[PDB]
């Protein structure tokens, strides 16, 4: 099974203030479990998953101190980046970080991740070997030259191969409830008259997790392309997703068209058409 | 878990 642990860090510079806005979000198999926000009344690591309550007071204090340190790392790095690009402090600048690891067949390290971005675009990233850095621009070349000399990659490799794998094994064992939860989609076809002789059949998909879904419209085996027009996968708000795929069909011949839904957790792919009411 | 970064950019 492909298991993963990720840490999504954000640092937005605040003009006129010493410390930037620091947000650190933790994920286990694309599910939020921990969160830190500097904008909060009491800045500390808070549990976002129910199974995360099993952790002692010593754990939360240790993680909060890591965030307070990272808050200062991003603060100084932000100031150095202004000099590299000849930017002003009066403007707001964003620095983002993505760090984590992937699990193979059964609870063993596959690939280590450590990426950085400045102003939405790729800045510096750690390669698969976890020893070499890939710099996207001339300013990042300075960062690469610094980190190769100080040996930063060795410290990140030690975490990614050690601590990251060790803690993910603990979380996957502790979290069996919300972590393994899979939701099958509920599908139905709606009728909408388009213009005079043409009609639009909309195939809905509701209450499904994860978001990875496939909707295909077909006329007795032969599928329809480009004339389909589909919508982007949107969250319902209760920890589940929504999606629909329309089709331009003639009036009276709507029964000849069938919608097929493909999703993991569904034992057999859903086959459906119009009722009618 | 989180990791602490070493040298700054």
């Amino acid at each position: 099974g492909p298991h993963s642990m990720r840490y999504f860090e954000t640092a937005v510079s605040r003009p006129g203030l010493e410390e930037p806005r620091y947000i650190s979000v933790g994920y286990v198999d694309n599910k939020e479990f921990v969160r830190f926000d500097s904008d909060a009344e009491n800045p500390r690591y808070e549990p976002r998953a129910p199974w995360m309550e099993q952790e002692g007071p010593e754990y939360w204090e240790r993680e909060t101190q890591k965030a307070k340190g990272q808050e200062q790392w991003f603060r100084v790095s932000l100031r150095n980046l202004l000099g590299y690009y000849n930017q002003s402090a009066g403007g707001s600048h964003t620095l983002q970080q993505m760090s984590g690891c992937d699990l193979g067949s059964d609870w063993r390290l596959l690939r280590g991740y450590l990426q950085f971005a400045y102003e939405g675009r790729d800045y510096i990233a750690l390669n698969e070997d976890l020893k070499t850095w890939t710099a996207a621009d001339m300013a990042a070349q300075i960062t690469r030259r610094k980190w190769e000399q100080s040996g930063a990659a060795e410290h990140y490799k030690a975490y990614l191969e050690g601590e990251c794998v060790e803690w993910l094994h603990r979380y996957l064992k502790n979290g069996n409830a919300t972590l393994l939860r899979t939701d099958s989609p509920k599908a139905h076809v709606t009728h909408h008259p388009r213009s005079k002789g043409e009609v639009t059949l909309r195939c809905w998909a509701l209450g499904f997790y994860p978001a990875d879904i496939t909707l295909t419209w077909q006329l007795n085996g032969e599928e329809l392309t480009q004339d389909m027009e589909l919508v982007e996968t949107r969250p319902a708000g209760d920890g589940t997703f929504q999606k629909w795929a329309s089709v331009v069909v003639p009036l009276g011949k709507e029964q000849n068209y069938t919608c097929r839904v493909y999703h993991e957790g569904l034992p057999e792919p859903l086959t459906l058409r119009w009722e009618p009411p | 878990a989180s990791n602490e970064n070493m040298e700054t950019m």
Partner: T-cell receptor
Amino acid sequence: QQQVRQSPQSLTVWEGETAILNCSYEDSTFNYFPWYQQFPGEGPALLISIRSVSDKKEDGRFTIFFNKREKKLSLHITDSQPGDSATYFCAASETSGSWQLIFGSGTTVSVSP
Amino acid sequence: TVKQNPRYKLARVGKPVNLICSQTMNHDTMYWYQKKPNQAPKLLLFYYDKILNREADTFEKFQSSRPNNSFCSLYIGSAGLEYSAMYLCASSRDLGRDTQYFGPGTRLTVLE
């Protein structure tokens, strides 16, 4: 330019006189201005500091005179004594790098007894 | 109360140089400066807790290590003429406007 500019390079005053140590900056972003005193064989030590909001700040015989409009600072030593004969450095700090101090060349004062 | 030993140091060209700095005040920030005659102290690098920051113009010439909050080291590899200057170590309770406490300094001279 930041930079920091300090005038003059060296100053000689008599015992009891007032020693005027001028300093100038270019960047409007600078808000904190600490003055460091260094004696031979010893490292620099904080003497007196001023903020951009204030215009005087007195500490016994040592008084600063800040002017935001002309971007100039001056350190006045009311009653000079040979014990004040040291190298004076004027530092500058901005909100976006409060940890970093931008020091000036330094004025070497010599109080004649 | 920043301690720096030795007060003076002499090294040969191409030999490694290591300068030590003591705390006892339990300060979060420890700075390293370079002081040349008739020149202002130039900031080389600083350490906030375990985080290292080296200045863009300075980096390639200086390395640093902080095993604990009390000790901070400045490493030169290899030494060569340009390094001949006084090296001042500073300490601060925060990463901001608060006071910087300087040590006596280490006057380094590198000869052929």
